[PDB]
Short mmCIF file of C-alpha atoms in Angstrom, two decimals:
data_model
loop_
_atom_site.label_atom_id
_atom_site.label_comp_id
_atom_site.label_asym_id
_atom_site.label_seq_id
_atom_site.Cartn_x
_atom_site.Cartn_y
_atom_site.Cartn_z
CA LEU A 14 -38.75 -31.87 -2.91
CA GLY A 15 -36.06 -31.25 -5.61
CA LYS A 16 -34.38 -29.06 -2.91
CA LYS A 17 -33.96 -32.16 -0.61
CA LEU A 18 -32.17 -33.97 -3.53
CA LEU A 19 -29.73 -31.00 -4.01
CA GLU A 20 -28.96 -31.06 -0.21
CA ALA A 21 -28.82 -34.94 -0.09
CA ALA A 22 -26.58 -35.18 -3.25
CA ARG A 23 -24.22 -32.59 -1.61
CA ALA A 24 -24.21 -34.31 1.86
CA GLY A 25 -23.37 -37.70 0.21
CA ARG A 26 -26.49 -39.34 1.82
CA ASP A 27 -26.52 -42.30 -0.68
CA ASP A 28 -29.67 -43.82 1.00
CA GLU A 29 -31.81 -40.59 0.85
CA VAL A 30 -30.91 -39.83 -2.86
CA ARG A 31 -32.60 -43.15 -3.97
CA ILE A 32 -35.66 -42.60 -1.63
CA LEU A 33 -36.16 -39.01 -3.01
CA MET A 34 -35.93 -40.10 -6.73
CA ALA A 35 -38.47 -42.90 -5.92
CA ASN A 36 -40.92 -39.93 -5.42
CA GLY A 37 -39.85 -38.53 -8.87
CA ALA A 38 -37.97 -35.44 -7.52
CA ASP A 39 -36.50 -33.28 -10.37
CA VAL A 40 -33.01 -34.87 -10.99
CA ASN A 41 -32.15 -31.70 -13.06
CA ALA A 42 -33.23 -29.42 -10.11
CA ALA A 43 -30.94 -26.30 -10.17
CA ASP A 44 -29.98 -24.16 -7.09
CA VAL A 45 -29.39 -20.32 -7.02
CA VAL A 46 -26.03 -20.60 -8.96
CA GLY A 47 -27.46 -23.25 -11.40
CA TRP A 48 -25.92 -26.42 -9.80
CA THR A 49 -27.82 -29.76 -10.29
CA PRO A 50 -27.47 -32.71 -7.83
CA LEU A 51 -24.88 -34.11 -10.36
CA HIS A 52 -22.84 -30.83 -9.94
CA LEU A 53 -22.84 -31.16 -6.08
CA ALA A 54 -22.07 -34.95 -6.40
CA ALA A 55 -19.18 -34.27 -8.89
CA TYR A 56 -17.73 -31.40 -6.73
CA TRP A 57 -17.82 -33.10 -3.26
CA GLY A 58 -16.65 -36.44 -4.80
CA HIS A 59 -19.70 -38.77 -4.30
CA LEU A 60 -19.13 -41.60 -6.89
CA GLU A 61 -22.12 -43.80 -5.79
CA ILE A 62 -24.60 -40.83 -6.09
CA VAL A 63 -23.11 -39.65 -9.48
CA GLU A 64 -23.92 -43.15 -10.94
CA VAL A 65 -27.38 -43.33 -9.18
CA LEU A 66 -28.23 -39.82 -10.62
CA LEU A 67 -27.09 -40.73 -14.22
CA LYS A 68 -28.94 -44.14 -14.05
CA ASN A 69 -32.11 -42.08 -13.15
CA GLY A 70 -31.53 -39.93 -16.31
CA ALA A 71 -29.70 -36.78 -15.06
CA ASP A 72 -28.56 -34.19 -17.70
CA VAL A 73 -24.78 -35.05 -17.96
CA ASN A 74 -24.08 -31.73 -19.86
CA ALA A 75 -26.14 -29.63 -17.34
CA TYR A 76 -24.30 -26.24 -16.98
CA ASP A 77 -24.39 -23.60 -14.16
CA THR A 78 -24.98 -19.81 -14.71
CA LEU A 79 -21.25 -19.53 -15.78
CA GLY A 80 -21.39 -22.61 -18.12
CA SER A 81 -19.47 -25.13 -15.89
CA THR A 82 -20.55 -28.84 -16.21
CA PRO A 83 -20.17 -31.65 -13.60
CA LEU A 84 -17.18 -32.89 -15.75
CA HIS A 85 -15.51 -29.42 -15.25
CA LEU A 86 -15.80 -29.94 -11.42
CA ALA A 87 -14.86 -33.70 -11.44
CA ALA A 88 -11.72 -33.02 -13.61
CA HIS A 89 -10.66 -29.87 -11.59
CA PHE A 90 -10.90 -31.66 -8.15
CA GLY A 91 -8.97 -34.89 -9.02
CA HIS A 92 -12.05 -37.23 -9.09
CA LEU A 93 -10.75 -39.97 -11.49
CA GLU A 94 -13.67 -42.46 -10.94
CA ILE A 95 -16.35 -39.70 -11.44
CA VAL A 96 -14.64 -38.31 -14.65
CA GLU A 97 -14.73 -41.88 -16.16
CA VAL A 98 -18.44 -42.50 -15.15
CA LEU A 99 -19.44 -39.04 -16.60
CA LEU A 100 -17.48 -39.66 -19.89
CA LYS A 101 -18.97 -43.24 -20.11
CA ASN A 102 -22.46 -41.54 -19.90
CA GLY A 103 -21.62 -39.27 -22.92
CA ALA A 104 -20.40 -36.06 -21.18
CA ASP A 105 -19.08 -33.38 -23.65
CA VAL A 106 -15.26 -33.79 -23.07
CA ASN A 107 -14.69 -30.51 -25.07
CA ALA A 108 -17.37 -28.65 -22.96
CA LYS A 109 -16.51 -24.90 -22.47
CA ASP A 110 -17.70 -22.55 -19.64
CA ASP A 111 -18.40 -18.79 -20.32
CA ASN A 112 -14.55 -18.28 -20.03
CA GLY A 113 -13.78 -20.91 -22.76
CA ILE A 114 -12.16 -23.20 -20.08
CA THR A 115 -12.49 -27.02 -20.65
CA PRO A 116 -12.27 -30.05 -18.27
CA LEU A 117 -8.69 -30.62 -19.66
CA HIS A 118 -7.65 -26.96 -18.90
CA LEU A 119 -8.79 -27.48 -15.23
CA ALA A 120 -7.39 -31.07 -14.76
CA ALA A 121 -4.09 -29.88 -16.43
CA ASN A 122 -3.90 -26.70 -14.22
CA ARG A 123 -4.19 -28.78 -10.95
CA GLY A 124 -1.81 -31.46 -12.40
CA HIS A 125 -4.22 -34.48 -12.22
CA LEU A 126 -2.04 -36.56 -14.66
CA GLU A 127 -4.37 -39.66 -14.58
CA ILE A 128 -7.52 -37.53 -15.41
CA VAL A 129 -5.72 -35.68 -18.32
CA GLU A 130 -5.00 -39.12 -19.97
CA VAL A 131 -8.70 -40.24 -19.53
CA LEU A 132 -9.88 -36.89 -21.07
CA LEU A 133 -7.43 -37.20 -24.06
CA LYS A 134 -8.62 -40.87 -24.48
CA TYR A 135 -12.22 -39.58 -25.16
CA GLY A 136 -10.93 -37.00 -27.73
CA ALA A 137 -10.18 -33.85 -25.63
CA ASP A 138 -9.02 -31.19 -28.19
CA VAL A 139 -5.42 -30.44 -26.93
CA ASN A 140 -5.29 -27.23 -29.09
CA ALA A 141 -8.60 -25.98 -27.47
CA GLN A 142 -8.07 -22.34 -26.24
CA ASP A 143 -9.74 -20.26 -23.44
CA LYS A 144 -10.64 -16.49 -23.72
CA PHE A 145 -6.86 -15.72 -23.19
CA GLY A 146 -5.79 -18.17 -25.98
CA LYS A 147 -4.17 -20.72 -23.57
CA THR A 148 -3.90 -24.50 -24.32
CA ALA A 149 -3.39 -27.25 -21.64
CA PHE A 150 0.30 -27.26 -22.83
CA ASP A 151 0.63 -23.44 -22.22
CA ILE A 152 -0.65 -24.19 -18.63
CA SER A 153 1.84 -27.11 -18.05
CA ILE A 154 4.82 -24.96 -19.32
CA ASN A 155 3.77 -21.97 -17.07
CA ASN A 156 3.13 -24.37 -14.09
CA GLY A 157 6.48 -26.11 -14.94
CA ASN A 158 4.83 -29.60 -14.65
CA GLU A 159 7.15 -31.35 -17.21
CA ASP A 160 5.46 -34.78 -16.53
CA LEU A 161 2.15 -33.27 -17.88
CA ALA A 162 3.85 -31.28 -20.74
CA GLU A 163 5.26 -34.66 -22.04
CA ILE A 164 1.69 -36.15 -22.38
CA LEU A 165 0.53 -33.06 -24.43
CA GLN A 166 3.81 -33.09 -26.52
CA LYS B 770 -17.40 8.43 7.40
CA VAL B 771 -17.54 8.79 3.55
CA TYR B 772 -18.19 5.43 1.73
CA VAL B 773 -17.95 4.87 -2.08
CA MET B 774 -19.68 1.67 -3.37
CA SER B 775 -21.75 0.42 -6.38
CA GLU B 776 -25.49 1.26 -6.34
CA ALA B 777 -27.30 -2.00 -5.28
CA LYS B 778 -28.59 -2.78 -8.84
CA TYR B 779 -24.99 -2.90 -10.32
CA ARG B 780 -23.65 -5.48 -7.74
CA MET B 781 -26.51 -8.10 -7.56
CA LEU B 782 -25.84 -10.41 -10.60
CA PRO B 783 -22.61 -12.22 -11.65
CA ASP B 784 -23.14 -10.69 -15.17
CA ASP B 785 -22.77 -7.15 -13.60
CA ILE B 786 -18.95 -7.86 -13.26
CA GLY B 787 -18.54 -7.13 -17.04
CA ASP B 788 -20.37 -3.74 -16.66
CA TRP B 789 -17.34 -2.42 -14.61
CA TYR B 790 -14.57 -0.72 -16.70
CA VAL B 791 -10.95 0.15 -15.63
CA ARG B 792 -8.84 2.79 -17.53
CA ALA B 793 -5.50 1.47 -18.94
CA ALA B 794 -2.26 3.56 -19.28
CA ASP B 795 -3.08 4.18 -23.03
CA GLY B 796 -6.38 5.87 -21.90
CA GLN B 797 -8.80 3.16 -23.23
CA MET B 798 -11.53 1.80 -20.85
CA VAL B 799 -11.22 -2.04 -20.40
CA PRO B 800 -14.14 -4.21 -19.11
CA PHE B 801 -13.52 -6.78 -16.29
CA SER B 802 -14.63 -9.51 -18.81
CA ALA B 803 -11.48 -8.67 -20.93
CA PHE B 804 -8.82 -9.60 -18.26
CA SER B 805 -10.82 -11.85 -15.80
CA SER B 806 -12.37 -15.38 -15.67
CA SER B 807 -14.95 -16.54 -13.03
CA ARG B 808 -16.33 -19.88 -11.66
CA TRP B 809 -18.63 -21.05 -8.78
CA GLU B 810 -16.91 -22.84 -5.81
CA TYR B 811 -17.66 -23.61 -2.10
CA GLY B 812 -15.95 -21.99 0.95
CA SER B 813 -16.63 -21.27 4.68
CA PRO B 814 -18.59 -18.10 5.63
CA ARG B 815 -17.29 -18.51 9.27
CA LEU B 816 -13.79 -20.02 9.92
CA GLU B 817 -13.28 -20.96 13.64
CA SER C 242 3.96 -23.07 -2.64
CA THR C 243 7.36 -22.31 -4.32
CA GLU C 244 5.69 -23.57 -7.59
CA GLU C 245 3.17 -20.63 -7.49
CA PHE C 246 5.87 -18.02 -6.53
CA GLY C 247 8.13 -19.37 -9.35
CA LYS C 248 5.48 -18.74 -12.09
CA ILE C 249 4.89 -15.08 -10.93
CA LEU C 250 5.07 -13.04 -14.21
CA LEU C 251 7.71 -10.21 -13.95
CA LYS C 252 7.15 -9.08 -17.61
CA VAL C 253 6.37 -10.35 -21.19
CA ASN C 254 9.12 -9.60 -23.82
CA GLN C 255 8.37 -7.72 -27.13
CA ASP C 256 8.46 -11.17 -28.93
CA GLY C 257 5.70 -12.49 -26.57
CA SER C 258 8.03 -14.71 -24.39
CA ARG C 259 7.30 -14.57 -20.59
CA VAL C 260 9.87 -13.66 -17.84
CA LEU C 261 8.76 -15.57 -14.66
CA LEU C 262 10.28 -15.03 -11.14
CA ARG C 263 11.97 -18.52 -11.35
CA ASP C 264 13.95 -17.22 -14.43
CA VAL C 265 15.83 -14.62 -12.23
CA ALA C 266 15.63 -16.30 -8.74
CA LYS C 267 15.76 -19.62 -6.78
CA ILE C 268 12.39 -20.29 -4.97
CA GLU C 269 12.70 -22.48 -1.79
CA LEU C 270 11.20 -22.63 1.76
CA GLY C 271 13.96 -21.23 4.05
CA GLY C 272 14.44 -19.55 7.47
CA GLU C 273 13.43 -15.86 7.99
CA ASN C 274 17.08 -15.73 9.26
CA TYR C 275 19.96 -18.31 9.04
CA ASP C 276 21.58 -16.67 12.14
CA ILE C 277 20.69 -19.23 14.91
CA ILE C 278 21.85 -22.90 14.40
CA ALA C 279 21.68 -25.42 17.33
CA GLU C 280 23.21 -28.94 17.82
CA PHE C 281 22.31 -31.61 20.48
CA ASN C 282 25.42 -33.81 21.18
CA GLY C 283 26.82 -32.75 17.73
CA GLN C 284 23.53 -33.79 15.96
CA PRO C 285 21.41 -31.23 14.00
CA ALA C 286 18.63 -29.87 16.32
CA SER C 287 16.22 -26.99 17.12
CA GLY C 288 14.64 -26.10 20.51
CA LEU C 289 12.84 -23.53 22.74
#
């Protein structure tokens, strides 16, 4: 039953996600790798389902077997609307995976300038380091994205 | 043929990556965890 | 992309400063050869 929700949240079947959670299917149902419906919704870029899942009380700081949150995925894959909705629903902006990588690190690395500003707005630690001691600035300088490096001083 | 490969039990879990050590020039053994980061993503198992 | 080739790390200096490929080279998309150039009525062109 919770399996159907994982598959439906991934597929973007907005209609089926509501029908399944009307039968009280586990909204924090994890797959083999530890991905919730909110992970699959954040990754594949389903805004309507992300909201519907969070309004039905989905763990916003749910983490996979490597410590990646839906915010990690949303930020990394240039999903501006989903990042905002997640952060509005109290998603740890300074969340770290098993590598020490943050939603800012990922957004910064792919050069999603709009998302970086939204993350900083909610108090994203700019000096936050990964396991290799790299900031979002270190990334921008190495990438040579001077537009992004300006925002992080 | 002669095939070298990990015994099944040492290549089943993502956490087994860190159990694998490589020898540096200075002679010290370095775990994969020291110089590598990992994350889950989606890709095709059959590209047409 | 040229962006990814540019940030290839050649070496790190003793003072911890990085030497990237873009610090010793220009990185652009360009012909395998610049040997064959065609014009159609004096206008820049390719063909088969």
